[PDB]
Design a protein around this nucleic acid. Structure first.
Length: 166
RNA sequence: GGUGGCUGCGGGAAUCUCAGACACCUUAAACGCUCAUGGAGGCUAUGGUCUGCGAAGUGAGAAUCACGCGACGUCGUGUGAGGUUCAAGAGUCCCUUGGCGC
DNA sequence: ACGGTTGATCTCAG
DNA sequence: GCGCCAAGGGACTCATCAACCGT
C-alpha cells in the first residue's frame, strides 16, 4: 500500500565487504563518467544524452576492455547510479536547484539493487542480496510488504546497513 | 569495601552483562586506554590548568561469550549466540547549517 | 530444469 | 573568508521482463 524501509545493519564478511566497497566505487565511477559524458554532449551538440543512451553506453562500458570490472559489480547498482544522474539532471531542469557535480570518495555512499525474479529474500538473521548472497544482519525487522529494492549503504569504516524497501 | 562515568561489541537509545582503563571515596563530577612516531603546545576565565620530567597532530592495534580449524598455554580464522524497556521510512539530488583548521 | 543475472525500457531539457 | 568533517532542509520518487549463463 506504501513504500517503507526496513533498515537492518549488514554484517558482511571479508568477501562481502570487498564486494560492497567495489560496488560503491563502481557506482561512483559510472556517475562521474556519465556526468562527464553528459556535459560533453551539450558542448558538442545542442541535445544531451537521455537515460536510455547513457544506459546503452554503460552496456558498452561493461562490454569494454579497460573498464571490464563494471561487469563484476551488480547491474542494478550501475543502472541506479545512472538513474541517480538522471534525477540530478531532472531536478536541475525542473527549475532552469544547483547543477550536478562530480563525486569524491565519500563515506555515506549507498548503492541500490532492485528485486526481480526472487532476487531479495529476507530471512531470520540473514538477507538474500543479489551479488552478495546471504548477508548476516542484526535487527532484521519483520517483513511487512512486497520487496522492491535494498539500498546497501556504508556509514563508517565498518558500519554497513541496508534500507530494504517494501 | 562503596560510588560515577569515558571507550569496544551487544542494530539504535537508555539501562544492563562483560571487557579496556580509571577515578572519586560518601559526592556525582571528570577522564578513554596501549604502542610507535611526533619534541613543545593543547584546554579554561588580558590572565589560570595538564604538559619539555613527553603537548597538539599522524594512524594502527586491543577492548562480549560458545564451539570448530590451523600455527607456535599464545596468535589467526570460520560459524553461531548476546537479556530486558521504547522506537524505527528510507533513498536521490541540490543547497546551507554548525564545528575545526588556515 | 534451477537458480540467479543482465540488457532494454522513458520524450524533453541548461 | 575559504578548505575539510559532519549534519540539516526541501522536493521528488520509491522497477519489470524476456532472455541469458553456469550447474
Amino acid at each position: 500500500i506504501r513504500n517503507k524501509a526496513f533498515v537492518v545493519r549488514l554484517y558482511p564478511n571479508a568477501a562481502q565487504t570487498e564486494l560492497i566497497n567495489r560496488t560503491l566505487g563502481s557506482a561512483r565511477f559510472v556517475y562521474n563518467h556519465f556526468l562527464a559524458r553528459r556535459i560533453a554532449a551539450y558542448k558538442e551538440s545542442g541535445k544531451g544524452l537521455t537515460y536510455g543512451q547513457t544506459s546503452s553506453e554503460l552496456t558498452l562500458l561493461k562490454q569494454a576492455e579497460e573498464t571490464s570490472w563494471l561487469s563484476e559489480v551488480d547491474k542494478f547498482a550501475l543502472q541506479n547510479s545512472l538513474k541517480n544522474l538522471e534525477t540530478a539532471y531532472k531536478n536541475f531542469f525542473r527549475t532552469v536547484v544547483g547543477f550536478p557535480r562530480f563525486r569524491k570518495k565519500r563515506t555515506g555512499e549507498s548503492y541500490r539493487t532492485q528485486f526481480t525474479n526472487n532476487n531479495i529474500q529476507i530471512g531470520e538473521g540473514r538477507l538474500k542480496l543479489p551479488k552478495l548472497g546471504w548477508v548476516k544482519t542484526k535487527g532484521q525487522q519483520d517483513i511487512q510488504g512486497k520487496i522492491l529494492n535494498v539500498t546497501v549503504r556504508r556509514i563508517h569504516e565498518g558500519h554497513y546497513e541496508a534500507s530494504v524497501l517494501c
